[PDB]
């Protein structure tokens, strides 16, 4: 879809003059040059012009430092990408209507993203989406049924967020997960018996905090301690048996047997 008047700057012209050392900026990239070679070698680049990047499929690294740029809609017409890599802290939204037409991308990466909302009932058909970097994710609100069918994820981090609710019917098929970190939680209301069905997991993080320890809140924690006492070691160098106790009163866990 060729359009005109898309390039307000000439930084890419400077890059071309530095690399190809061609005679003039007005010289267009010839058909022979593109059809002869397929790979371009220039590591650790700092290209400033974000335009013209759609027509070159050799995208590997884009350092997005641009003061005069105020448009993020230039990534709407991508329908042939296979690998993605970006770096931005203030990015909040991307144009929609892309996940339905493309079904070939495999790998993605994200750090300190601020994706405020995802469409509901979209990932169900996209069963091929395996990896998703959930680190320092800022998903303040999640739609119901996000990781129910998707059991192929290897890293699940919800630190520094406000998940007050759990997805519907998530615990039914949770027999293949490797790790799940419930620490740093700021919930306000939860149902009864939802945390008790998490028995196939391998590592829990809910101890060492001045939180509430009212029965039967610690009953699941006590059972998990008894059933996995020798497996859960602590990264911080310290004695293991006294690491995970009930907070509040400070009495030993072994003496407390919950009535009723």
């Amino acid at each position: 879809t060729p359009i005109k008047q898309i390039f307000p700057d000439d930084a890419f012209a400077e890059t071309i003059k530095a690399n190809l050392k061609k005679k003039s900026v007005t010289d267009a990239v010839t058909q022979n040059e593109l059809n002869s070679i397929d790979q371009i070698y220039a590591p650790d680049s700092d290209i400033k012009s974000v335009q013209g990047i759609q027509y070159l499929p050799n995208v590997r690294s884009l350092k997005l430092r641009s003061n005069k740029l105020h448009d993020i809609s230039a990534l709407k017409e991508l329908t042939n990408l296979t690998f993605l890599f970006l770096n931005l802290n203030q990015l909040q939204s991307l144009p929609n209507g892309v996940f339905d037409k493309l079904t070939n991308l495999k790998e993605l990466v994200l750090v300190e993203n601020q994706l405020q909302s995802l469409p509901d009932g979209v990932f169900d058909k996209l069963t091929n989406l395996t990896l998703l970097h959930l680190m320092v994710n800022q998903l303040q609100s999640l739609p119901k049924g996000v990781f129910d069918k998707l059991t192929n994820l290897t890293e699940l981090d919800l630190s520094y967020n406000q998940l007050q609710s759990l997805p519907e019917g998530v615990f039914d098929k949770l027999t293949q997960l490797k790790d799940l970190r419930l620490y740093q939680n700021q919930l306000k209301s939860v149902p009864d018996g939802v945390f008790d069905r998490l028995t196939s997991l391998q590592y829990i993080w809910l101890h060492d905090n001045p939180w509430d320890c009212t029965c039967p809140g610690i009953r699941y924690l006590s059972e998990w301690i008894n059933k996995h006492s020798g497996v859960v070691r602590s990264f911080i160098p310290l004695w293991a048996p006294d690491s995970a106790k009930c907070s509040g009163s400070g009495k030993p866990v072994r003496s407390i047997i919950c009535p009723t």
Binding site: N209, R233, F235, I236
Partner: protein
């Protein structure tokens, strides 16, 4: 406790830990193809 953790990180090597985390001795035998050939590349065998 609250807002106090460790800024450093460890390895966490355990016998029961995942077998795909033990340090495998994969030696990258970088055969640096420098311009310095040698005449003795094989014993030429000795037969009997």
């Amino acid at each position: 406790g609250f807002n106090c953790y460790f800024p450093l990180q460890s390895y966490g090597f355990q016998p029961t830990n995942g077998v795909g985390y033990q340090p495998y001795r994969v030696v990258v035998l970088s055969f640096e193809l420098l311009h310095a050939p040698a005449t003795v590349c094989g014993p030429k065998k000795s037969t009997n």
